[PDB]
Subunit: 221 residues, 5 copies
Amino acid sequence: DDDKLHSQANLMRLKSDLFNRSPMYPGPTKDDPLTVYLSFSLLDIVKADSSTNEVDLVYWEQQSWKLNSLMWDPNEYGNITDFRTSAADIWTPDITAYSSTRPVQVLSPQNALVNSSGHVQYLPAQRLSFMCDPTGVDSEEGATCAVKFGSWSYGGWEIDLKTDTDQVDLSSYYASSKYEILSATQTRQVQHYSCCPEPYIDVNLVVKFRERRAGNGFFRN
Amino acid sequence: DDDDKLHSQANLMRLKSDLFNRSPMYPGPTKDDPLTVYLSFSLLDIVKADSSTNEVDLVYWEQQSWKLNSLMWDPNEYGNITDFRTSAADIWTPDITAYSSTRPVQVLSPQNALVNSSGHVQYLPAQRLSFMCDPTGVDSEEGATCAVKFGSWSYGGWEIDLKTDTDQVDLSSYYASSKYEILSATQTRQVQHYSCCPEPYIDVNLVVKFRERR
Amino acid sequence: DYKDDDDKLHSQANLMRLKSDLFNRSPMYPGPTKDDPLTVYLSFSLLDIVKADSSTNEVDLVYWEQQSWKLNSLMWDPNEYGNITDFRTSAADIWTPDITAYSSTRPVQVLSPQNALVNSSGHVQYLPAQRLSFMCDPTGVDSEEGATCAVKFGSWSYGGWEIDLKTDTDQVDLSSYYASSKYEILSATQTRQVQHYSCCPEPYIDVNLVVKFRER
Amino acid sequence: KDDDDKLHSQANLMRLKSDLFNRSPMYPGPTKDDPLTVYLSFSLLDIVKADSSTNEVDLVYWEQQSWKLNSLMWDPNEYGNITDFRTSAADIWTPDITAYSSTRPVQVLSPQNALVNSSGHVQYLPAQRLSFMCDPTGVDSEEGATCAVKFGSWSYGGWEIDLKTDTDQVDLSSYYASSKYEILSATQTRQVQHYSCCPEPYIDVNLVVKFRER
Amino acid sequence: DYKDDDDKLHSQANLMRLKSDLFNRSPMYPGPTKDDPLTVYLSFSLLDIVKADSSTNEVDLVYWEQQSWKLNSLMWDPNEYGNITDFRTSAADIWTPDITAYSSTRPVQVLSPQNALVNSSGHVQYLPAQRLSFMCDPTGVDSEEGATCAVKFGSWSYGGWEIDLKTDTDQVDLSSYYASSKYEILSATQTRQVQHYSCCPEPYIDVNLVVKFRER
Ligand SMILES: *[C@@H]1O[C@H](CO)[C@@H](O[C@@H]2O[C@H](CO)[C@@H](O[C@@H]3O[C@H](CO[C@H]4O[C@H](CO[C@H]5O[C@H](CO)[C@@H](O)[C@H](O)[C@@H]5O)[C@@H](O)[C@H](O[C@H]5O[C@H](CO)[C@@H](O)[C@H](O)[C@@H]5O)[C@@H]4O)[C@@H](O)[C@H](O[C@H]4O[C@H](CO)[C@@H](O)[C@H](O)[C@@H]4O)[C@@H]3O)[C@H](O)[C@H]2NC(C)=O)[C@H](O)[C@H]1NC(C)=O
Ligand SMILES: *[C@@H]1O[C@H](CO)[C@@H](O[C@@H]2O[C@H](CO)[C@@H](O[C@@H]3O[C@H](CO[C@H]4O[C@H](CO)[C@@H](O)[C@H](O[C@H]5O[C@H](CO)[C@@H](O)[C@H](O)[C@@H]5O)[C@@H]4O)[C@@H](O)[C@H](O[C@H]4O[C@H](CO)[C@@H](O)[C@H](O)[C@@H]4O)[C@@H]3O)[C@H](O)[C@H]2NC(C)=O)[C@H](O)[C@H]1NC(C)=O
Ligand SMILES: CCN1C[C@]2(COC(=O)c3ccccc3N3C(=O)C[C@H](C)C3=O)CC[C@H](OC)[C@@]34[C@@H]5C[C@H]6[C@H](OC)[C@@H]5[C@](O)(C[C@@H]6OC)[C@@](O)([C@@H](OC)[C@H]23)[C@@H]14
Ligand SMILES: CCN1C[C@]2(COC(=O)c3ccccc3N3C(=O)C[C@H](C)C3=O)CC[C@H](OC)[C@@]34[C@@H]5C[C@H]6[C@H](OC)[C@@H]5[C@](O)(C[C@@H]6OC)[C@@](O)([C@@H](OC)[C@H]23)[C@@H]14
Ligand SMILES: CCN1C[C@]2(COC(=O)c3ccccc3N3C(=O)C[C@H](C)C3=O)CC[C@H](OC)[C@@]34[C@@H]5C[C@H]6[C@H](OC)[C@@H]5[C@](O)(C[C@@H]6OC)[C@@](O)([C@@H](OC)[C@H]23)[C@@H]14
Ligand SMILES: CCN1C[C@]2(COC(=O)c3ccccc3N3C(=O)C[C@H](C)C3=O)CC[C@H](OC)[C@@]34[C@@H]5C[C@H]6[C@H](OC)[C@@H]5[C@](O)(C[C@@H]6OC)[C@@](O)([C@@H](OC)[C@H]23)[C@@H]14
Ligand SMILES: CCN1C[C@]2(COC(=O)c3ccccc3N3C(=O)C[C@H](C)C3=O)CC[C@H](OC)[C@@]34[C@@H]5C[C@H]6[C@H](OC)[C@@H]5[C@](O)(C[C@@H]6OC)[C@@](O)([C@@H](OC)[C@H]23)[C@@H]14
Ligand SMILES: *[C@@H]1O[C@H](CO)[C@@H](O[C@@H]2O[C@H](CO)[C@@H](O)[C@H](O)[C@H]2NC(C)=O)[C@H](O)[C@H]1NC(C)=O
Ligand SMILES: *[C@@H]1O[C@H](CO)[C@@H](O[C@@H]2O[C@H](CO)[C@@H](O)[C@H](O)[C@H]2NC(C)=O)[C@H](O)[C@H]1NC(C)=O
Ligand SMILES: *[C@@H]1O[C@H](CO)[C@@H](O)[C@H](O)[C@H]1NC(C)=O
Ligand SMILES: *[C@@H]1O[C@H](CO)[C@@H](O)[C@H](O)[C@H]1NC(C)=O
Ligand SMILES: *[C@@H]1O[C@H](CO)[C@@H](O)[C@H](O)[C@H]1NC(C)=O
């Protein structure tokens, strides 16, 4: 049972070495660029407001990246290959929804997973209000909306974005939602501004949805 | 007698300082240092059920308990203190969360925890929760049925194992004049597997059947 | 006069010296224990019943809650500190009890600066003004007999062997109640209660606030 | 060269702030032996909402507060002739003035910073949105509705803090011309309150506003 | 590449070194004075008119507000810092101006991470995205001429001798305005104004944002 206090001490020592004994990573630069992978799972479309043209979505947004400053040798740490930590202990990217109408709300505990090769996985669940015209949601063809995500302060030469797939994950979508999903895609886009040389990257989340019509009966999920 | 109670008070200051200021905070469980967390619910009120958004608002107390070796002490060195209350910010707490909440949880009680000499912690946040629920049927005799799963957000079953003492949600505090009456409320431990990973994942499924008070 | 100015200066330095000896000398009070229990006195003054929602069965109440307790670690000899017999300070500088409404439906909102009064015998007086939403069925509010609701207040984490709760009176103070409120108060009472549970030896104390009210 | 003088005046300001704030313990607040006079004045910006279902009204206003501390004085000659500065309100003591009949926490609409001058005067001007207890009945007639809310210290009696007003007329010059509600009059009046339990008098400023639908 | 990783490490150290020298090596900037006046450039990009409330005469606007200024104490020689000419940093790490909307009815809400760009000549660029409720009478929004509203922005505590405000253009940027908004913009202008008060010698500067809009 002295093995247990031992591995606890190894973890404590690892985090102290990583966090306490080095200054926090200052973020990416044009000389030290970063790639952030984004992926979305849509959970629920909660509300569509046709008087303001705002829609409210609940989703999980997976973010991952890699820092050399987060690497270690599992063998000096008693074979710890990964650990959970508070997101406040690490640098995280400034990714944001460009068309939000209210401050995004965080639904999940804010913690991340770091492994020995320096990879970070951060998966905040969020509630978002964003600009969307729901017109046609009460029909069978439904309504279509889009919101773009990306760094607020960094261009493409500092932070690049990529997605693993263009399919947004619907496997967790709430089956009894007021709204059913017809389709959801997530697409990397490159934009330029005349005033500036560098590219700007965003991931475009496009959702087609309609009012769910129920039969009379219990729909179980 | 009044000079004993000053020692008593100094004994706790000393115990608190020895636990909290001497080693670092517990950095969560690991695969080879896993932790069991007991979870149990007491439902207070169903406040609102919204047909327009399909969200329901529950008020409840969520009882969490676990045990840490680093929180143990010998009461004889501490003036026979067997336990104390402390701010929850002073201790590690599990990341248990409702998977299908639609709004940030609202905290209805001061956040303090009880720690006892064998290192067991008792944490009892009272909360208001909005979660995804379709209230249809709430006006029938059969009523409406909703489910919300709770568990660790970031830790798997090899790190945090999750348990209940009973599969019965505690109704003894449920508000008798609520707009909604409770037909049944259950809390069931479930084990889940993802094809992506060998690790089992644990949740407690809170299932509630309810209808408008008639 | 620079004699008056010096006087002012010396008296400020005295209060500063008192506060520094109390607060910066010994670690903050760790809270009460079985061997060192604390008595907390509660009293309520009702200000407005702002609304009653019959769709959710919630009521919103504005009130002032007076809390007071004594700590030996807050005591001083006024002779050593310029004849200061008391002072006002931020509620953050001192231990406060964990008293909470057991049947709130939303986090309680604090309406007043959070400051407390401390006296040389170690007594603390703290009067937060608050707005609370709590579970109440306001059926009958539209009839002469009115509606009745109750909410219990007490320590969330400390049982009766640690914190003992008491009331000055069993009569809620109505003297500051808003005369133009949508609801008039038929009566309000505040009563200490002691509860025991099969599971546990320790008694649990609360103060039970019962308000009977109807539309103006 | 010119950048040198500017650099010097910055150093001067920083030196003054350090001497005032870092080089001494903050003012403990007023006492019976060291009382403080606080000047209060109101400018009404907008009556936003009048809710007849709850009897609450929502006002946007700025509240001017000023007082003088000997411990904020300095000789401009030792400070590069700085006669005043702007500072964060957290850096200095501010009085506990409060609306006694508020129904929700006041919302702060302006950056919280104060102006301090060499003679020790502080000027602090928070812009606020306030919901308070008011019965709007009559708001739909030509006579209008009347409402009053009292402002004063929460924790200090008249022997510690004394309130004064510059004038009994509330400043309307900034009132929003297109507001849903028109102002017939607004007065701000110092009042002395007595309670049976206590020798100490209690001071407040009573803000009375007559208004009607525009 | 392994030596390529040494170079990245070195560049991280350079930036960390830079920030440490700017921030931890001096007391905070105390803000502007009449002897060290400051010019702030303001520009607006209109995003959405979310809601026009005719029962309260409040309108809710989503916009980006670009603020730019220059501090001598933020300058550095890139040659001493590995040729870094700019960096991003948390807005909390720097002084920021007190610019505020004078006719807001609710606290402004921040929609974007608060970080700023600083470059070697001492220029800062801060671009908060915000949602603002302000006093506006939406009458005529359902007609052809539409409705017209205006809100003034400027320093809350500094006069013209300390903070001067400019705009680069009198034209609000509409290129990002949501095409599907409930409301379409007929025009938006942003104009520097100089306010004078009888009581005071010092002028007070503001930027007046005027928006003419109607139901789509
Ligand atoms: C610190 O950072 C700074 C800023 O990042 C950096 O300075 C810049 O460095 C880069 C890399 O050197 C420069 O970008 C390059 O530009 C090259 C083209 O410019 C050359 O040709 C220009 C045009 O000449 C014609 O036109 C003019 C009229 O316009 C006319 O008078 C001429 O006669 C001629 O007809 C010319 O203006 C320019 O001359 C300037 O710069 C040189 C050297 O810097 C200097 O000697 C001169 O006196 C004068 O100041 C120059 O001759 C371009 O070819 C090159 O692109 C190649 O490499 C890139 C990758 O680097 C590839 O993408 C591409 O495929 C090519 O292979 C590159 O884009 C930039 O112009 C520098 N200067 C400034 C101010 O931005 C420093 O180097 C950094 N310091 C350190 C220590 O790292
Ligand atoms: C700091 O602040 C707190 C309050 O915020 C102050 O607390 C007070 O402390 C004093 C001193 O301990 C208390 O006085 C004592 O009271 C007890 C109990 O009797 C009181 O309450 C009883 C029921 O609640 C009741 O029997 C009594 O009623 C009668 O008596 C009072 C007059 O005292 C009268 O007003 C009533 O009409 C009744 O006739 C009474 O309410 C009492 O037993 C103590 O008595 C003895 O000791 C005193 C000297 O202390 C002596 O003079 C007597 O002869 C006797 O020997 C004592 O009177 C008071 O109750 C506390 N009030 C509280 C807690 O709110 C505290 O004093 C402040 N400190 C300082 C330094 O200012
Ligand atoms: C700092 C704020 N920032 C937010 C921006 C905002 O981007 C977007 O909203 C956006 C991006 C790609 C495609 C469409 C976008 N978009 C819109 O343009 C409106 C709508 C809400 C939306 O989704 C992110 C990228 C870049 O900053 C890294 C910006 C660009 C960099 C450059 C560009 O100026 C033309 C542009 C900025 O204007 C400011 C900068 O000037 C220094 C910026 O505010 C955003 O412009 C859209 C754009 C800059
Ligand atoms: C990090 C966030 N986290 C939240 C999750 C969320 O879990 C659930 O929502 C859930 C769990 C059991 C049963 C039903 C669940 N569920 C749903 O799946 C939708 C509905 C709202 C709901 O309640 C907790 C457990 C685990 O993390 C410890 C997750 C799984 C671990 C693994 C799994 O990937 C296949 C899965 C994650 O996708 C991410 C991970 O990849 C590293 C995760 O986001 C959640 O997936 C549902 C699931 C992970
Ligand atoms: C820590 C949370 N705490 C809140 C409680 C809550 O108290 C009440 O809600 C309550 C008390 C007396 C009478 C009625 C009460 N009540 C209700 O039960 C419903 C309604 C909201 C209400 O007012 C305060 C006192 C004590 O904690 C010091 C509790 C008791 C201690 C003991 C008791 O268990 C039987 C009881 C607790 O259940 C938990 C404990 O077991 C771990 C507790 O959650 C509360 O029980 C009501 C009760 C505990
Ligand atoms: C500490 C909180 N405090 C708020 C009070 C509240 O003041 C008012 O509400 C008020 C003041 C003057 C005129 C009318 C007032 N008033 C009302 O009383 C109802 C309505 C909301 C309103 O505006 C401020 C002044 C004094 O505090 C320095 C109080 C008085 C000091 C003394 C008085 O006891 C009778 C009175 C207090 O009751 C408590 C105290 O006991 C130590 C107090 O809570 C307030 O009483 C209204 C009154 C005390
Ligand atoms: C400190 C608070 N402050 C906010 C003010 C508020 O500014 C405005 O509201 C404003 C400014 C320019 C033009 C129109 C303005 N305005 C209005 O006045 C009403 C309407 C809402 C609006 O936008 C900012 C500028 C200056 O402070 C730097 C003020 C002026 C400086 C001077 C002026 O006194 C006459 C005036 C102040 O009254 C207080 C001061 O006394 C020291 C002030 O509160 C604001 O007056 C509008 C005005 C001062
Ligand atoms: C510390 O806490 C645990 C529970 O959190 C206590 O364990 C209990 O032991 C008592 C023996 O009287 C039993 O009532 C329970 O069955 C045990 N708990 C559980 C969950 O089964 C332990 O005794 C506590 N130590 C004390 C009280 O000092
Ligand atoms: C730092 O940023 C400033 C702008 O904030 C840049 O200065 C601008 O340069 C452009 C192009 O020459 C000119 O229009 C003006 O001289 C500047 N604009 C403003 C607002 O002053 C500058 O390029 C940057 N400095 C360095 C050296 O990188
Ligand atoms: C860490 O995570 C990355 C991303 O999934 C993975 O490719 C890598 O193999 C992991 N490293 C270790 C040692 O676990
Ligand atoms: C305190 O009071 C005593 C009288 O009891 C007096 O002699 C003394 O001067 C006072 N102390 C101060 C500092 O005023
Ligand atoms: C400081 O403020 C007061 C008014 O509050 C004014 O009378 C005075 O002139 C100012 N400065 C001084 C006294 O030098």
